[PDB]
Amino acid sequence: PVTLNYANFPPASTFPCIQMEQWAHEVRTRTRGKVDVLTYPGGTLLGARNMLRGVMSGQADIGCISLAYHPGVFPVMSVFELPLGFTSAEAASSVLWELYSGLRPAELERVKVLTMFTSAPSHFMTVTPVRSLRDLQGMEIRGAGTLSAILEKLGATPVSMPMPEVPEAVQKGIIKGLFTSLDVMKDMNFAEMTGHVTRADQAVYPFAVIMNREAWERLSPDVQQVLDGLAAEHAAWTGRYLDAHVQDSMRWAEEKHGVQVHTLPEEDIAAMRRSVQPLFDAWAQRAADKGADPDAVMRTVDALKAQY
Ligand SMILES: O=C(O)Cc1c[nH]c2ccccc12
């Protein structure tokens, strides 16, 4: 009987926390009680910025990081912060895990990765309506990592910060909106702060569930096969729950808070995609400078997408 503390950073109602709870439930079940998990949601054990170095301290056995909160640190897996044309968190979460399983980039060698998943595709949630690219101009919008560099290519003024700091940045007028997936309209009640939603069909935010290496090595081989055996299912499950939850979330926001939804013209969309193309090369260049094979990574992205 061994018990693992699992640090998380956002409120318990948000999807990073819902997936942690479902994960914990499967570990208890599949190990027939041999493993238990005590979860600390809402940043009570570790928060968003001390998540990684704190899992590695051993201050918590397991944690959940958003790759985009750590610029430079993940030269390979940050490809998953580019617009890879995904339209569901299910598909993207699955392809992300396979791409990680099959390559094991050294950026992530100092911890043990238990599973990976993403957000749904990003859209604009703003306090004033955005009906064109022109409206985006100069408007401070929250992103992180490469989703900020995307905001920037589109002409908005990106402000990088983790999700928990976002409600307060909006309220105090430091940002005018946020660029991410629509589950937060409910799970963080952005429906009471940003009454407008514009379709972007943009890049996802990728997450990794990590574990302290020494903690992982103190697990027997049998318990280890249980956690490795849970990884791919759980990635898909997390992606599938979120695609459903995004619908409910937006249903609630419209009929209980009168959210207004807008779309951009096709010529604005065309042009925004042309605007972000240079990020693929800059991503390819930082990976190479770090000793990675971006050509290989993109070849593996392509091939995985033609399955999932
Ligand atoms: O925007 C992000 O930081 C990624 C993201 C999307 N939905 C979230 C819910 C809780 C915490 C992080 C996220």
d(CA 232, CA 199): 29
Residue 177 CA, ligand 1 centroid: distance in Å = 14
d(CA 144, CA 74): 14
Please report the atom of ligand 1 found closest to the CA of residue 11: 10
Method: X-ray
- Look at strands 62-66 and 206-212 and give their pairing: antiparallel
Strand partners, 82: none
134 is in an annotated binding site: no
Q: Which of 181, 189, 194 to mutate to test the pocket of ligand 1 (most atoms within 8 A of CB)?
A: 181
d(CA 246, CA 94): 18
Which tokens belong to 273? 């995609």
Give nearest CA residue, ligand 1 atom 3: 163
3-state secondary structure 128-145: CCCCCHHHHCCCEEEECC
User: Is 8 within 8 Å of 16 (Cβ atoms)?
Assistant: yes
d(CA 78, CA 101): 15
Return the residue matching tokens 């997390």.
Answer: 238
d(CA 287, CA 294): 6
182 is in an annotated binding site: yes
User: Is 134 within 8 Å of 171 (Cβ atoms)?
Assistant: no
3-state secondary structure 186-211: HHCCHHHCCCEEEEEEECCCEEEEEE
The dihedral region occupied by 291, where left means phi > 0, alpha psi between -120 and 50, and beta the remainder, is left
Residue 209 CA, ligand 1 centroid: distance in Å = 14
Nearest to 163 by CA among 6, 16, 19, 54: 16
Residue 142 phi, psi (nearest 5): -65, 125
Alpha-carbon torsion angle 8, 14, 18, 21, nearest 10 = 30
d(CA 267, CA 299): 29
Residue 163 CA, ligand 1 centroid: distance in Å = 6
Which tokens belong to 33? 């009680």
69 is in an annotated binding site: yes
One of 3.60.10.10, 2.70.98.10, 3.30.70.141, 3.40.190.170 is the CATH number of 1-308, namely 3.40.190.170
Q: Give resolution, Å, one decimal.
A: 2.2
Is 180 touching ligand 1 by the criterion CB < 6 Å?
yes
94 is in an annotated binding site: no
d(CA 157, CA 211): 35
Which tokens belong to 304? 């995985």
Residue 127 CA, ligand 1 centroid: distance in Å = 19
Residue 119 CA, ligand 1 centroid: distance in Å = 7
Cβ-Cβ contacts under 8 Å for 231 (sequence gap 6 or more): 97, 101, 114, 115, 116
Which DSSP letter does residue 14 get? S
- Residue ranges of alpha helices (H) inside the chain are 15-30, 51-57, 89-101, 133-136, 146-153, 166-171, 184-187, 213-217, 221-228, 231-257, 266-276, 278-289, 294-305
Is 212 touching ligand 1 by the criterion CB < 6 Å?
no
CA atoms 48, 52, 57, 59: torsion sign: positive
